[PDB]
Ligand binder design. Structure first.
Ligand SMILES: [Pb+2]
Length: 9
């Protein structure tokens, strides 16, 4: 979940 968000941003 944390990774997904870092990538998105
Ligand atoms: Pb991250």
């Amino acid at each position: 979940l944390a990774a997904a968000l870092c990538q998105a941003l």
